């Protein structure tokens, strides 16, 4: 599908509300495998299970190992811009 830009809003007491799988060391994109109901990704409306996370706040995640992606994603705060695509 088309590449989309998605805005997520989160407070500092919460996580993103997603589960991710994959990573460069597995030859697979960083994929959203779960969206936890009521948490920031669900509330933002624009992220879905099966989306590939291509970038977050301008940081490219297309060539990123799993734990690299976890550190990068968990460091973002507040108003967070995602670049995603559903394949």
């Amino acid at each position: 599908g088309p590449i989309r830009k998605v805005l997520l809003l989160k407070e500092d007491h919460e996580g993103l509300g997603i589960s991710i799988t994959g990573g460069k060391e597995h030859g697979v994109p960083i994929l959203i495998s779960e969206i936890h109901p009521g948490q920031p990704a669900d509330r933002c409306g624009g992220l879905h299970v099966g989306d590939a996370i291509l970038a977050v706040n301008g940081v490219n995640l297309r060539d990123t190992k799993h734990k690299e992606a976890v550190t990068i994603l968990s460091q973002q705060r507040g108003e967070i811009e995602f670049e995603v695509v559903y394949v």
Partner: peptide
Amino acid sequence: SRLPTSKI
């Protein structure tokens, strides 16, 4: 089982 999953 080969792919990792992290809750974030």
